[PDB]
Amino acid sequence: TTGERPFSDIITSVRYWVIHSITIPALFIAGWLFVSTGLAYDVFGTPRPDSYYAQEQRSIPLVTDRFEAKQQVETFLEQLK
Amino acid sequence: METITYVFIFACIIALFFFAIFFREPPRIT
Amino acid sequence: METITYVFIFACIIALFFFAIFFREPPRIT
Amino acid sequence: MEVNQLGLIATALFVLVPSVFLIILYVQTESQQK
Amino acid sequence: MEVNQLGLIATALFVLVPSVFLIILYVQTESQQK
Amino acid sequence: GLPWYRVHTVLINDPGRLIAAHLMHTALVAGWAGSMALYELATFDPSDPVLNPMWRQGMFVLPFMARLGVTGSWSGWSITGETGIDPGFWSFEGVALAHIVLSGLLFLAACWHWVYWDLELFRDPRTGEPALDLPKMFGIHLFLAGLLCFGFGAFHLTGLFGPGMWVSDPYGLTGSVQPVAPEWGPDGFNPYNPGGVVAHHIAAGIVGIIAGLFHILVRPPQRLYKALRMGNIETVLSSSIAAVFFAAFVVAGTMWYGSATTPIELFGPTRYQWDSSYFQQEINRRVQASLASGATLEEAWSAIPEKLAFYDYIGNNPAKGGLFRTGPMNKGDGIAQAWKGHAVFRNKEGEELFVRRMPAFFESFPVILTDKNGVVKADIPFRRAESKYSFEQQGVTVSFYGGELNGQTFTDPPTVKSYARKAIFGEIFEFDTETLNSDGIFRTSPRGWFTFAHAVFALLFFFGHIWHGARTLFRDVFSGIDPELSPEQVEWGFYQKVGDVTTR
Amino acid sequence: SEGGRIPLWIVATVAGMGVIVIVGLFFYGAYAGLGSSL
Amino acid sequence: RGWFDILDDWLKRDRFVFVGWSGILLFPCAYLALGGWLTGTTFVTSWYTHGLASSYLEGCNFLTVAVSTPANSMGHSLLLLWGPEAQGDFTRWCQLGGLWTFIALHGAFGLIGFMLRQFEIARLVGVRPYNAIAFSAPIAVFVSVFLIYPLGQSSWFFAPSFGVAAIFRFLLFFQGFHNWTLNPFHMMGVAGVLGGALLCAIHGATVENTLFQDGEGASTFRAFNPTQAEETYSMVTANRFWSQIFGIAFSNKRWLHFFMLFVPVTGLWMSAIGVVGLALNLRSYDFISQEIRAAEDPEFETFYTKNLLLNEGIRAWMAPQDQPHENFVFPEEVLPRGNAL
Amino acid sequence: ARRTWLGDILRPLNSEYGKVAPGWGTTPLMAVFMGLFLVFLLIILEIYNSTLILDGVNVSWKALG
Amino acid sequence: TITPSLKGFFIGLLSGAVVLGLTFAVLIAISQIDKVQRS
Amino acid sequence: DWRVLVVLLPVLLAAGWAVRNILPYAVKQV
Amino acid sequence: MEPNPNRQPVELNRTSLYLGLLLILVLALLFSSYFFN
Amino acid sequence: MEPNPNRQPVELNRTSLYLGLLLILVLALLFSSYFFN
Amino acid sequence: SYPIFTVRWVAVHTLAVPTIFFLGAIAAMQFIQR
């Protein structure tokens, strides 16, 4: 042993579950809402299903310039009107 | 020469199998 | 490669002169 | 076939040099005082 | 020049095989006791 | 007895014989350099620096002689295509001879240090045991390295007392050896600025001198002496091996991406110049400038240097080779003889069509022709039954401008197709494939072979470093662990601090 | 609180069932909505 | 016993998870590489770099998610968050493929950290550092495949992307473009991995089937004490068995276990050398004699020429979508195809 | 062991084996230089990598003619 | 002249120094507090 | 952004709750 | 000349001879096709 | 197995090695022109 | 008799906290429709 309390003890203790029957569902629900609110899309810049192409476009918005790549992506996004 | 080389190396390997097996240094218990 | 061979063999012979002279088995009187 | 002409000498030395190295070490090991 | 294409390996093995035979014999002699 | 892979360990406590072995290694390396230069001189064709330069001929040490200013032969030629030049003693031949003689002398020295191994100099005056004071030795050697580095920068490269170094224009057309002044502003750290190589050797030299003196005069801290085992020569082996694989990765990198020290006239163009169409862009610029000055198409393309056109050809791309495709580039596509001139393709409507170039990734590539907007206009079809774009259907012609085929036009589909096929490689050249029995398969240049060997050797020397570092730090147990190793040392919680018995 | 109050076998069973549920959900999602090919 | 030594004391405490000086490098870099992979595969697209969906958020599954390499136009940019490309924008940085360089670089330093951990613990416990030494093979592989290989090529784009199906693609690409299976260094790699697997299997099974009866139980695991002095299985019986079955047999345990280190480690190192060659397209792609014969003689066929036809198919059919920066348009009529298919 | 003229000359240069400075000595200073050296490499790498872009420093063949 | 990427480099440098500094401040502090007991 | 507060309200409510429940033992430990 | 105290005998037992020859011969069987090309 | 009493150790002294090598190398230097032809 | 907030505790939670958050997200994702 290395001094920490055995996991067997902890996870079969009442207090552990008083704490975690709150903290685990809270986290789960938080992640859920991170998706359902749509925040994930905006944080990571991921296309929603209607934002991969403009309506009559069929050309991938591939980044082609290293140093003005940011401006490129921005223009691409504006192109979705 | 290529064929001769390939078959020659193979033949040497088979001979090696023979010596490694029947003319190995015998394992001896201590 | 012929030239390289001739010169190689020659070079080895000179090397051999060096060892045969300076690294000979020393003669010893009984 | 139009194979590389150095292929033969290459394979021959590739085998013979190190094999000969090992044979020399082995034989001089055997001959050491038992 | 248009030399025989086996001249190289012939010469190489001509040198190496008996040279190596002798080197083996010599080294196993030195490694014998006394 | 010693196992075969340890025979050389007998040198560890024999400074004299270690120095002998090192002398012998150095003799062998100088001897290799001499031999290699002699062989290259026995095979090098100096008659055409434009289309048959050294990097087409599998020359590996000739470009390193050239880089530092050896450009002439005693026989009278120079690598820049001059004649009637007197190089003095320091021709290619002189350098080779110098290395051979050096090799001989190192050999003899090695014999001396092997026989007279038991010099008092190698003995610790107090204990009588063999001993080398590695920290002070490091000071001395670092001081000397410093001096040499500084002098190389300050006298050789500057042309102050020396030839200088190889420099060229941004398109490797007019390279030569020149004195180079140091660059002390930030552009000095630009790899394509030679002034930075100069400034580097001057400043790093001075730093090496100062640091060297420091390491001669100041002893190691006891804590570092102990931590790095500075009484043990293998520690130096480990850190040296580390420094060396660092340096090898660096030279691999600057060889592959290019720098002031890896000129394309000496090693060949880079792959990235093909990727970005560097040369094609410059050629187009020149041709355009010509037309705008009132020149005809034929005149404009005829004004393009063959050397420039030859850079714009994928057969000189170092990324087109094979691991076992051996020898010079000439053995592949052949010895280049002449530019055929620039091929312009047109369809029956007289639209100019452009052949899609082969990327380096592809061993084979289709033949596709588009207009100036990338719209497919013609191709060579695989399946014919539903072909729409065949050269026959589209009436594709090819007209040449500049080069040997200048002013000519071809209309028979086979000829047109042959030329399109060559157009996927960039500019088109006539090759002599007979002299060397060339087989038509691309081989890499010295840029490629150097990069490969040195990235590989670097990677292997990483393992070398790991192994010898381990041997150094675990010297006490490399024959086995303590036969009386207390179970409590490796048990859990017996000691507060792992392997610290004073923490029970 | 004191350790051992809740039987480890119950904890294991419940945990396992949760795992099967969440993975079951993910396999449900392979057939519905995004990624369903439909 | 100054601050350095107090710190050393604390770093080397015998706790559930050992920390060490090496833990300072290892844990943040390993955590950031893992977390970066999970973040990317959960939430992050590859639309702007590859024209691919690559996250759970977009509808990918475990097999198809990846953190993909950056656009080819990024070249070999470190692609730092504060670099000239992303310019501090986290979202753009994700869209440009910043997470790929993030994961590879933090990962590389994490591997350094872990190998340092192997040295540190071996030194503290009093064993020889052969575990770390063995770990040099994973290092060689990671550095050759994820760093040197793309560095030799045009850009990070042609490095492997961090994903199951993405890796599968990496494999198929290497067959089609490099004829990698033909490469003797890869072959040595295969021999080391399959040979390693064989040694694992055969040694485990042999030990398990030459056990001494050291208990009364029919389930024989309990009849072993970790502290015991005696061999738990019969090396002599093992040796006679394999001698009579296979002709040769181990007789030295030390050699046996060294050999078990040596085979897979060497295999991986060789494979590394090959990939370093492929960084420059220095391939074992062809046999020149084969091609001279086949070119002149339309009835000459071997499995080698057969496989090249396969490679040609792979390149032509995969390149336009696999290499979108090239803007390949290969009209129907130029696609290589056999009859009917 | 054998004395020689040159040997006798160089003897002092190899006579201080194992001699150290007490404790940590100049390790802090060394650390500083190490730090600086790291930053130095970081710079040249980033310059070569086009991650760090400086006025008058065009990292291309077209740097100077 | 300080270009945007030189400024970005200073930010990177600074951020790294902050991460490492906070790391060692906290490690040294905790080590100071919870000492190993010797006899 | 209201979404970050609506999303990271469960996380901070969890942190606050467990802080509330473990506070005495944490103070006793510290 | 006085004898050098650092000398050691060298050994290669028979099993090492066999392993070594196997390595060499098999490496040759593998690489020869590429040498012929 | 009873050891064979007919066995005998073999020797090649250094001078014999030098003579032999000389013989081989000089023979080779002589015949190689004819091998290349 | 046992501490609560240890190196192990931290390690464990640096893995476990994000894992549950993430699983919540992926769960939510299973009901996204194009």
Ligand code: CLA
């Ligand atoms: C730094 C190393 C190096 C590099 C980069 C070069 C580069 C070059 N050489 Mg030079 N050369 C070198 C060292 C080098 N040389 C040395 C040391 C010699 C003395 C032998 C020579 C003698 C020489 C000659 C005679 C010639 C060249 C030629 C050339 C050119 C053609 C290269 C070629 O075809 O390679 C081909 C490379 C290979 C086929 C790769 C071999 C890979 C090996 C076999 C792998 C070994 C595997 C190993 C057994 C695995 C063990 C596993 C185990 C651990 C378990 C090229 C510019 C040619 C030229 O064009 O001259 C003008 C030429 O004719 N070189």
Ligand code: CLA
């Ligand atoms: C500066 C370079 C250098 C030096 C001076 C040494 C020196 C040593 N090594 Mg280290 N090592 C190095 C780099 C170096 N190594 C590298 C790069 C690796 C990874 C490949 C290693 C991996 C290594 C291992 C695994 C071991 C050593 C061992 C040793 C010791 C015994 C060597 C011996 O007797 O071999 C005898 C070798 C032979 C009789 C024949 C070797 C034939 C080789 C494999 C093929 C042909 C090589 C060819 C001629 C090389 C040409 C030059 C090359 C640069 C291209 C000796 C101190 C041994 C040791 O520590 O013992 C205590 C040991 O076990 N080394």
Ligand code: CLA
């Ligand atoms: C020891 C652990 C460790 C290591 C080795 C790394 C290493 C790396 N990180 Mg990571 N990172 C870490 C922990 C670590 N990180 C932690 C804990 C976090 C959470 C904050 C991050 C968050 C993070 C992000 C968001 C990013 C990185 C990135 C990187 C890469 C670029 C770093 C760089 O250029 O620094 C430069 C700084 C140094 C090297 C510090 C040295 C400072 C010297 C020694 C002292 C001098 C300082 C001086 C006094 C300050 C003067 C400032 C003045 C000029 C204004 C590099 C691979 C980047 C990346 O991966 O891009 C793809 C990136 O975007 N890291």
Ligand SMILES: C=Cc1c(C)c2cc3nc(c4c5[nH]c(cc6nc(cc1[nH]2)C(C)=C6CC)c(C)c5C(=O)[C@@H]4C(=O)OC)[C@@H](CCC(=O)OC/C=C(\C)CCC[C@H](C)CCC[C@H](C)CCCC(C)C)[C@@H]3C
């Ligand atoms: C794909 C094959 C493969 C995997 C996944 C793998 C994994 C592992 N090997 C380890 C060890 C070893 N492997 C060894 C020999 C081998 N290992 C091999 C092949 C593998 N080894 C082979 C073929 C050999 C024979 C030579 C040895 C000798 C060891 C060890 O000593 C060590 C161990 O302890 O094993 C029990 C462990 C190191 C843990 C660590 O570094 O933590 C730190 C984690 C870090 C630093 C993060 C690294 C980040 C990586 C480099 C990039 C990011 C990867 C993403 C997070 C995931 C992407 C997933 C997609 C690709 C699908 C880990 C379990």
Ligand SMILES: CCCCCCCCCCCCCCCC(=O)OC[C@H](COP(=O)(O)OC[C@@H](O)CO)OC(=O)CCCCCCCCCCCCCCC
């Ligand atoms: C009972 C389940 C069996 C599962 C299939 C067989 C697994 C073991 C077979 C390996 C043979 C190796 C060569 C002989 C090696 C050998 O000689 O074994 C020896 C070893 C010890 O033998 P013992 O005599 O001690 O015990 C076996 C019997 O004698 C009864 O006590 O055998 C076992 O441990 C049996 C294990 C049964 C339980 C194992 C379950 C493991 C697999 C679970 C499923 C995993 C699927 C993963 C898919 C994602």
Ligand SMILES: CC1=C(/C=C/C(C)=C/C=C/C(C)=C/C=C/C=C(C)/C=C/C=C(C)/C=C/C2=C(C)CCCC2(C)C)C(C)(C)CCC1
């Ligand atoms: C004595 C004398 C002399 C002489 C000298 C001489 C003559 C020398 C020579 C020398 C020489 C002449 C040398 C050479 C050397 C060489 C070498 C050393 C090589 C090596 C190689 C290698 C090592 C390789 C390897 C490989 C292969 C084979 C394959 C591929 C891969 C590799 C690369 C690895 C004089 C008169 C001067 C004076 C003094 C005396």
Ligand SMILES: CC1=C(/C=C/C(C)=C/C=C/C(C)=C/C=C/C=C(C)/C=C/C=C(C)/C=C/C2=C(C)CCCC2(C)C)C(C)(C)CCC1
């Ligand atoms: C990137 C980045 C970062 C980081 C972040 C992080 C660090 C994160 C982490 C994260 C995490 C850490 C996450 C996690 C997740 C997890 C998950 C998502 C899991 C899942 C799982 C599962 C799904 C399972 C499955 C299975 C298996 C595996 C086997 C058994 C059976 C089963 C099927 C159950 C920072 C900010 C620094 C900066 C920026 C960038």
Ligand SMILES: CCCCCCCCCCCCO[C@@H]1O[C@H](CO)[C@@H](O[C@H]2O[C@H](CO)[C@@H](O)[C@H](O)[C@H]2O)[C@H](O)[C@H]1O
């Ligand atoms: C063309 C490629 C050919 C490759 C050739 C490679 C050459 C290899 C040379 C190996 C040198 C062998 O080195 C040889 O070692 C043995 C022991 O091992 C030494 O032998 C010494 O040890 C033994 C054992 O204690 C004593 O019995 C013996 O009396 C003593 O002299 C020899 O004095 C030495 O000459």
Ligand SMILES: CCCCCCCS[C@@H]1O[C@H](CO)[C@@H](O)[C@H](O)[C@H]1O
């Ligand atoms: C070992 C061979 C020594 C041969 C020496 C020949 C000297 S040659 C001499 O060298 C000078 C310096 O380069 C030149 O200036 C001069 O033109 C040249 O003739």
Ligand SMILES: [Ca+2]
């Ligand atoms: Ca022909």
Ligand SMILES: [Ca+2]
């Ligand atoms: Ca819809």
Ligand SMILES: [Fe+2]
């Ligand atoms: Fe075992």
Ligand SMILES: [Mg+2]
């Ligand atoms: Mg779904």
